[PDB]
Amino acid sequence: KMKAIVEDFLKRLHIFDVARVPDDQMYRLRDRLRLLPVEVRRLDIFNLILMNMDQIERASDKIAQGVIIAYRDMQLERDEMYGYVNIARNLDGFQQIN
């Protein structure tokens, strides 16, 4: 967030050989950048990705969001696509630990 981006930035601008850039400069550079709008183009797309983000993640084949523990002989559910399985599209009623 710091350097990383800045570095690439200047490089593509050609003109200067980074390195000899006082550290007070590169960061200060960010401080100014992080205060502007964003080419509708650019922006307009990110808004898009975020809205669908969730949907992709769970929609994948390898990987799912967390598991629950009941220590309560629990009844397995049935869903056409998987057969006799133990899913549950809704965690509500048990603490959540990020």
Binding site: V40, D44, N47, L48, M51, N90
Partner: protein, 397 residues
């Protein structure tokens, strides 16, 4: 609560800024906000109603977002949207109404309904925005602690009161002296009468006074003050104070002498006007005091002299009066006035659904009763209920 607000300006600034055509970019900042909502919702079930003739409609959520793709909206885009809004409309209505009836003596200022108690929840606050609607603007500042303030017109500060006080009377009621008045809404009319036309009064002048104590302070009031009380300028047959008989009032009007209006705040004179009729400003007051006199005319043409004999019977009753009207004012507390529909909205929803009388509000939301005993609980409930009515009127009128 603040939650609730958004839900609307959301829809209005929505059902309004979305029409077959408009170039997208007028809503980019809008579409977004919208979606955000849908998400937070979907998956949570809701319940409303459960009293009088208020249906118990149940609700559920599971809706697709809104393609933020296109550059110019095509009709097809609208319809697939309006159909999703019309569930929120018909919803909110059933939501407002539900919390627009329940009342609480203790914390009658906070949320009550099983619908709202769940809204103040934290996972929901991810919505608030554009609080420019005069009422919410004031709700916040109050929850935060500061000088609130609302704008009115012909405000409704005076509980209805129409009566008289006989300072001199006798069984025959043939030589009375006193005052009669009508305080109602934003107006006061008061007349001072002296059947004897101050014949035996010191300096041939009879002093009168009318004091009205407001239940709430009014600030920045624009007021019309005029001489004479037309309402008490005609012949009347009135019931006696004890209700046992009736007296006759046959007024003849003279100009009120030494008129002095004082607008007091906690006993202190804030504004005082001496015989100034027309438009006057009273900047901060909780009491109005009108003092005026009847002065027997020192010089009288025969026709006048004939009305005022040295001895009874007194057949023409000398009367002086004043009329005062508060055109506009600001109050830190919500009040009914001549322009806002809040009181009428709340009263109407309760009447339509046969809502039972509760522990806070007088039967029928009666204004006179309410303002006469305007307790803190009634005010907090009234403000909550008025703010909800205003949120509702942004979409449903």
């Amino acid at each position: 609560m603040d939650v609730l607000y958004s839900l609307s300006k959301t829809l209005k600034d929505a059902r309004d800024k979305i029409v077959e055509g408009t170039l997208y970019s007028n809503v980019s900042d809008l579409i977004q906000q919208f979606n955000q909502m849908i998400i937070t919702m979907n998956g949570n079930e809701f319940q409303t109603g459960g009293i009088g003739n208020l249906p118990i409609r149940n609700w559920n959520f599971d809706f697709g977002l809104l393609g933020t793709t296109l550059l110019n909206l095509d009709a097809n885009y609208v319809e697939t949207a309006r159909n999703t809004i019309d569930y929120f409309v018909d919803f909110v209505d059933n939501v407002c109404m539900d919390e627009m009836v329940r009342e609480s003596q203790r914390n009658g200022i906070a949320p009550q309904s099983d619908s709202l108690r769940k809204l103040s929840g934290l996972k929901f606050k991810r919505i608030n925005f554009d609080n420019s609607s005069e009422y919410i603007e004031n709700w916040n500042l109050q929850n935060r602690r500061q000088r609130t303030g609302f704008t009115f017109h012909k405000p409704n500060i005076f509980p209805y009161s129409a009566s008289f006080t006989l300072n001199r009377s006798q069984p025959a009621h043939d030589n009375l002296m006193g005052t009669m008045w009508l305080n109602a809404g934003s107006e006061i009319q008061v007349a001072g009468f002296d059947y004897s036309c101050a014949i035996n009064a010191p300096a041939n002048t009879q002093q009168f006074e009318h004091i009205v104590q407001l239940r709430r302070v009014l600030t920045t009031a624009t007021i019309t003050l005029l001489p004479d009380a037309e309402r008490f300028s005609f012949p009347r047959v009135i019931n006696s104070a004890d209700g046992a008989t009736t007296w006759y009032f046959n007024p003849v009007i003279l100009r009120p002498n030494n008129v002095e209006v004082e607008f007091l705040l906690n006993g202190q004179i804030i504004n005082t006007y001496q015989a100034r009729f027309g438009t006057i400003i009273a900047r901060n007051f909780d009491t109005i005091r009108l003092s005026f006199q009847l002065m027997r005319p020192p010089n009288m043409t025969p026709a006048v002299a004939a009305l005022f004999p040295n001895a009874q019977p007194f057949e023409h009753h000398a009367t002086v009066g004043l009329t005062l009207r508060i055109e506009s004012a600001v109050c830190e507390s919500v009040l009914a006035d001549a322009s806002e529909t809040m009181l009428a909205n709340v009263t109407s929803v309760r009447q339509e659904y046969a809502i039972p009388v509760g522990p806070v509000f007088p039967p029928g939301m009666n204004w006179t009763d309410l303002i006469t005993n305007y307790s803190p609980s009634r005010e907090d409930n009234l403000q909550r209920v008025f703010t909800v009515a205003s949120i509702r009127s942004m979409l449903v009128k």
